[PDB]
Each structure stands twice: as C-alpha cells, then as structure tokens.
Design a protein around this nucleic acid. Structure first.
Lengths: 58, 59, 87, 89
RNA sequence: UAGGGUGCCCGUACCGCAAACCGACACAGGUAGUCAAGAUGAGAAUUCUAAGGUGAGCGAGCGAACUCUCGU
RNA sequence: UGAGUAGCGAAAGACGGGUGAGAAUCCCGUCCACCGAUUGACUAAGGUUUCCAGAGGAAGGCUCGUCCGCUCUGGGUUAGUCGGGUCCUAAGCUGAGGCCGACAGGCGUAGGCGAUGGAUAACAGGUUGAUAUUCCUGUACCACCUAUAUCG
RNA sequence: GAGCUGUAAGUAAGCUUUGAUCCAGAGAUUUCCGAAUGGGGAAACCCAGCAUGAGUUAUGUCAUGUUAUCGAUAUGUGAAUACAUAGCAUAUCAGAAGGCACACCCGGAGAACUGAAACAUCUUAGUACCCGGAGGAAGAGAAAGAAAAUUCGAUUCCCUUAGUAGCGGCGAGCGAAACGGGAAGAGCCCAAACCAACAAGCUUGCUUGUUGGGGUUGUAGGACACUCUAGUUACAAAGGACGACAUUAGACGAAUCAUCUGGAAAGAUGAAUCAAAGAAGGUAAUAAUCCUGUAGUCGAAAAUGUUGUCUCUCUUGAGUGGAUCCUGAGUACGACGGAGCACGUGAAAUUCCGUCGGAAUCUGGGAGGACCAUCUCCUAAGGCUAAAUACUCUCUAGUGACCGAUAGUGAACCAGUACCGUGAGGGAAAGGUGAAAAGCACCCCGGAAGGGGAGUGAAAUAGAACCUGAAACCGUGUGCU
C-alpha cells in the first residue's frame, strides 16, 4: 500500500502489528474491555499488506 | 498371461460345437515352449512358440 | 508465539484457582512445552507447570438449523514468579 | 439514477404534485426517501417512507418543470443536462 | 566374544443388568469382568436383616356374572 | 365409524409443613414397606454431553406436574508412574524382487502391521455443584542432561 | 461515480470524492486429508531419519527443505565362474501413476429372460454388464478395387436401389452391395538394388553390424550408362521472429401533458410527439414517450485465440538406353478346428485366428462368388493423413399452439437432505400477507396462551396456523313433522 520502506522496517512492522496490537486487542475483546472493536479488522489487514509487498520483493 | 517372445503369438477364443451345433466357448492356446535364448545382457529363458523355433534362432 | 488465543474467565474453575493458576484457550496442535515457553516469552514469568485437556465439539448451538461448535483445547499454567495473565 | 440532495417532483402516487429534497437512497431496490412524501405512522410516531425512483422527476433549473436528464462530456468527465433546456443540473 | 534441572501425544465428565447400550418405545428379553457383611448352615442354598439404595409416571370406590393367580 | 369403547406395561404407601394461578403426583420431614451372591459398589464394550447450577412449562412423559434423561441460558473432563503410542509379537492381513494368469488380478519370499498374551517407575489423606493414583499437602520411584579402565 | 461492511432482521464499531462497496484481466496467499508418495493407518491422525537454523548453562521442544515404487540414464558397477556379467549403491528427469461426461469412439471377453404361440439349431444379440486405450472426435484411407462402357480412379457420410438378390427346423426371422445424385477434398514417406565413410576382424571387400547419399513403381518403375538445367509446421522435416480482428468489464441512446373513478393511473375522455427504437421486464391497475431498456453507433491497461504479410527455414526437376541387379518369406497358400463376411459348411469365392506342412521372382504374383483355359483390371506380405461424420459434463445469446407446485427434474424449499439399512443402496414432504412492515402504541379479563377494543391499512374472516377457501366431517339456533 505504497509502504515503500526498508525491508528490515517491513519485518519490524510485521512483528509489531502481528502480536502486539492485535494480540492485545484479542485479549481486551475477550475480557470485556475493548470498544472500538473495528480496530481489529484494521490491524489484520495491515498485517496482510506488509506481508504481500515483502513477497513481491521476494 | 503368456505370449511368444519373438513373434506375438497368443491364445485366441472361439466356439466348440457338438454334432447338433450346440455352441460352447473355448480357447486355442499357442504352442509355447520354455527355451533359453541368447540375448546380450544375459542369456535368458523365455516362452517361444514352436513355429518360430524352426528355421532361425539362438539357443 | 501466539499459540495462546484467549484467557478463560469462568466462575469457580478459573477464579477459585487464580491465586496461582491461569487458564487459556490455546491452539489445538500445541504441546505443554510450547505453551510453557510461550507464556514465559510473552508475560516474562517463570511457569512452574502446565496441564492441558481437549474438549469435544458440542452440538448445543442449534437454531433453526442444527450444528456443532468448535473443538477447543484449554491449558492451565501454574506460575513460580509473577502474575496478571488474564484481567 | 437520482442522487440525494436533489430537488425533485413526485410524478405518481398519492403525493403527486408535491416536491422535496432526496434524503436517503436505496439503490439495490430503486427506492428513494423524499422529504414530506409518504408520511407513515408506526406504533405512534410519524416518518417518511421510500418511494420507487420511477415516480419522481427532476426539476428544470430554468423553468421549474419536470424533465429527463442526459449526459454530455464538457471535458474529460460527465455532466448532467436537462432535456428541455441544456443547462447542467 | 567380533569390535541443580528436563520429561511428549490420545482417553478421562456421565449411564453401564440400564429411563442413557442391542431390542422402532422411559419396552418383564439380552449384555464380558472385579468386590462379596450378620443370625442359620455343607453352602455364593433357604428365611430375616447390614453397608447402600428403593417405593416402579394413573388413581378413588364397590366387593355382581365371567376370565386369570392363590388357600381350604 | 367402531366409542368416550380396549388399554394406561409385574410391586405399599400414610400423614404433616411448604412453594404456587393451580398439588394423590414437585421439595423437606416422621412412621411404614421392598432388595440385600443384589434393585448395593467399581469398571470393558456401546452410547456421545444424557453430567452441574440458575431459569421454563407450548410439545415429549401412556394421568398430573410448580417436576425431569425435555426447552433456554452459563459452566464442567487437568497425568513423567493409571489404559493405549514413542517396546515385543499370536492368528490374520499386506508384501520390494518373484511365480501364475484373456484383462481385471490370484498366490508368495525378505520386510511390515497386529492383542485378547509378555515387558514397563506412586502411595496415603483433603478438596468442589460438576474432575481425582490426574489438583493440593506429605512421603517416594524411574530415564535422560549439565557441573564438582569402560562400551561391547 | 456515491454510498458500504453477503443472507439476516438488530445493535456496536467503523470505512468512503485523497474515489469505499462493485464489475473485469493479471499477480500473491492457499491449513489437514486424498494417486498421497518418509514409515504406519480404523481418510482428515500417529511416529520418524538427514541438513540447516531459533531457544536453553545442557538435554527436553520448535521452524524450513528433503527422504515412497516403477522406468530410463551417467557414473562406483570389479559375484557362485578367474575375469567379466547377476546383484548392491549414488546422481538426474514437468517420465508414469490418479480423476472425470461408463455421452460419443476402437479393442478384449461376453449372457439371459424373450420369440418360434413347446424348444435342442436359429433369434433376443455380439445387445446388457465388465476390463484396457485414447481423442476432441475416433475408426477407415491413397486399389494385389469396382466392373464388363464410346470405362471409372483413396477413404468417410447421406438419399435411393430395396425389404430387392440372397441366408434359413428354407420355420420364426435375418438382409446386402455395385451403379447413380450429392457434402467434403492432403497426398505422400520408408525397405530393397547401388555410391561414399565407420570400427572389429581371419585376405580388403567388414548391410560380416553402424552412418550419410540414393530410391518408391504397373504408364511396370527403379538402380545402372547419357545430356541438361518451388516455401506449404494438419501428411509431406520441424524451432523461432512479424498488425488487423474475436472473447473476457463498459458509455451514449428519440419522444406526454391535462380531466373522471380510485388507496394508487399505465384505464376511460381530450389534445400532442418519436420511430433503423411498437422486443421485454418493473412501476401502488392495463405505459412506444416514468424507470431498466431496445434500433444505431462508440470502447479495452492486461491475458488468450485466431489470423494476413515480412523474415526464419527448406530444396536441382525432367527425357532417353537398355546387359545385368532390386522390388517387403516361415510370408502367400494348403489340410484340420473356429470366427467373420446379409451369406447357418453349403457347390462358398473375398478375410482373420491356433496347430502342422510350405511357393514364384516380371515369361513373375493376385482378382473377376467352387474349378480350368482365354481376355480385362491390379501390383499383398511396411506406415502416416485434414474435411465432410457422432455426442454434450460446460460457457454465451435465444426459442416453444412445453409444465405451472399431486404438474415440471427425485429436488421452484438451504434435497439426494429428514431419514432407513451392517452395507452396497433407497428417498420424500414443504410455494403465495400487503403496493409499502406501515408487522397492532395504548386500555381491559387472564399466571401465560388467547381474546375484546382502539389504532396502521383500500381491506385485519389480510395479524405471520397470513391470496381464494370447496367437499367429506363437527357444531349452534330455529319453520313443518
């Protein structure tokens, strides 16, 4: 999605979005503390884009 | 089943008739013989019909 | 890794033992070794032990059309130092 | 179609002859909500209800008359123009 | 004879001589194995009981003929 | 229609107090009665959520039902030592090469799979509405790893 | 080009003119099984070797790649038998495997009930089922043919001959072909005689085995001696480069207003317009002019298919002469036993199979329905090939004096499903409120169910047990008996 960043920044980004944001929101939506639930489907799709462009670079 | 090595001979199928023309299915086998013929790689023993063994072979 | 899915906050068999034991729904193809190392890598604790049990898919959820739920795997971890593994 | 924020006139129904602004649009079934048209009373509060888009006709910006709309290309894009006059609407 | 720690996967609830298994049924049938109290006795027989369970998913009257089971 | 007719599936219940719109039929209680080499306790098949708590009374229950193995909503199955795998092999099945066979394929060697049998380290007590040599307390045992001649 | 997060209603949270959702071409990802292929196996699970990497003082545990069988092929390939050659081992390979439309096609094997008013031949019938092999079609195919003329010139299909000539317990029945009129129109490459090279070998005579040239015939034609100078990748020998069309999204697209009834106008009454458009569907009723459309014209980043030219290839064609040499062998054919030809062993030609015997070489060899002689036509024992032809799992348009929910698919519905069987397998039944949910706020009896109002509606005996609502059957009231 026009991320156009250094591939190591792509790996830092997949590793940040991959657990931290998404895993935290998955715990919050279970223990009854997350509203703005639509964050989740945002982060998921972000973790797809960072992966696809890295695969395009190969 | 079996069949001649050199040529392709193999049993065929037909009828067997009585004196009243009562048909019944039967076979016609080939005259295969176990003969040790001489091909390079090794001399091997294979089925060959007695029709091919006449006039030309290695044994 | 994220081999842990959910905390399991139930009435007695998760809150009557939350003095030291913390229960999760985990992935269905993992060990207690994988979960014992995943908890220690996520929360930074020392996990004394871990017990796991499988649950079959119940056919309870039936609306106009009858169907089954998901098979699920539940893991209880006993800590040796630390806390706060489900809020 | 008829995009909202447009001043139309009701050509058929029991509201025919009135005119209002398009508020909502349901283009999967060709329904539009006009203002002040098809007032319904539900159990008791009173609202507007949808009307088939075949029934409302756009008003000429020149003579305030119901017309049809066509399309032209003034540039590298489309423009809507009335059928009676020729002005963008 | 020639030569101080680590410890995985599946089952585990419940009924199991039964209203939850095989008999279309909350059906007198069938269903492998372990345990095995007291009085009496050859005894895992017979009668009465212990540990433990149970009162059986239609009743209330009347006390005719007749059918079924039982006593003289 | 037969017709409010046949049946309602072996058997001991009685009263008191509740709850409730409604009680022979549900809950608690005292008296009585039945089994007790079994109707008691534990487990293999086999079922596969039927187990527990809070609510329900349309249908199921051969009557009733305020109740349930039924409907709704939330829960419940914890292992280094227990039964199976990471050990062994009966009977049997499968079988590289191989033999036989119109085709399909049949048989069979090395090898392999395979228990109902062989081998193999854990016991007492406590706890919940629902687990229990599994969780907890106490006391143990076995295999491997790292530290401070043997293998055959 | 303005809304959207499928059904599926509702909430909650959000995205979108800085172009969401949506449509199309291409790309990425694609868990476990399954031929399933590392080993095992009660499909969707268990247990591993090796290499490498992540973690731990260290084991334990992870992530990724690879490891089946057969075939061929290079190498190590050297036994019992010296050596070699079976084994054994390593490396390489879009090599095979399985599936599906058991619709069509070819081959192998192959019934029976039925008919004959019995049935044994014969028919049903080389049909059903089964197995192998493909292909988009297949099979056939370039005269050892048909025939009897002033001849024809591969094969395939159709019409007709013709229910003819024939076959036959000569019963029941089976049943041609040639001609002639047409669809379609591809013909060619090898083997052999001889020429030049290649090893090994006992003279060099080694197609002694290998390779390239040569050459394909009945007009007998070729070698042999002699002169003399078009491509066609669908056969012919197979690899690449070269702009127009077609498919896969789309855009524009003429012309109507008023009155009456009505809940609502498209109907009736008046006037009026368009038409290369009066097909059709929707719209509160029956619309050429309200919407979606139709006639007509325009459009394509990218993928594919087909196609034209230019390259890229390929490539000496005929006429004479005749000494002599070549022209497909355990083949043709015969006897015995079968089958196939419309043709049942018959006087049975033509053609295949198993077993035995076994020819000739252009004066040659075969056919013209036993067989012989004379005449005429042809040149087997090697192979490839497009069109006309058959069928439909599937996609794109469209049609019907086809059905209209007991019909039409078994299935208009979440059906091959409830279910039912150990299993193979069998198999239903279920449509409709209204134009728009406006789907009954509120009051009263009742524990709730259910009503009675009052409201929505054009209609509530339209209230989700929803169009209409009939007969059997079940009731309540009453006139005469």
């Amino acid at each position: 999605k026009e991320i156009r960043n250094l591939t190591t920044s792509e790996i830092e980004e997949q590793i940040k979005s991959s657990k931290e944001e998404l895993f935290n929101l998955r715990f919050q939506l279970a223990t009854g503390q997350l509203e703005e639930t639509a964050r989740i489907r945002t982060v998921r799709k972000t973790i797809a884009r960072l992966k696809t462009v890295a695969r395009e670079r190969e | 089943g079996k069949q001649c090595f050199v040529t392709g001979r193999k049993a065929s199928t037909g009828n067997r008739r009585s004196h009243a023309l009562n048909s019944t299915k039967r076979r016609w086998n080939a005259n295969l013989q176990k003969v040790r013929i001489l091909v390079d790689g090794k001399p091997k023993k294979v089925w060959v019909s007695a029709r091919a063994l006449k006039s030309g072979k290695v044994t | 890794r994220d081999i842990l899915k959910r905390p399991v906050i139930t009435e007695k068999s998760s809150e009557a033992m939350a003095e030291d034991k913390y229960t999760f729904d985990v992935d269905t193809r993992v060990n207690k070794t994988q979960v014992k190392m995943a908890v220690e890598e996520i929360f930074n604790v020392k996990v004394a032990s871990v017990n796991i049990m499988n649950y079959k898919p119940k056919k309870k959820r039936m609306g106009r059309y009858q169907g089954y739920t998901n098979k699920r795997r539940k893991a209880i971890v006993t800590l040796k130092e630390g806390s706060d593994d489900l809020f | 179609h008829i995009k909202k924020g447009d001043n139309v006139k009701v050509i058929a129904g029991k509201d025919k002859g009135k005119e209002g602004k398009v508020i909502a649009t349901l283009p999967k079934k060709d329904r539009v909500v006009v203002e002040g048209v098809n007032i319904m009373k539900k159990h008791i509060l009173e609202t507007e209800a949808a009307i088939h888009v075949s029934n409302v006709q756009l008003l000429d910006p020149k003579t305030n008359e119901p017309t049809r709309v066509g399309y032209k290309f003034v540039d590298g894009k489309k423009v809507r123009i009335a059928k009676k006059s020729g002005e963008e609407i």
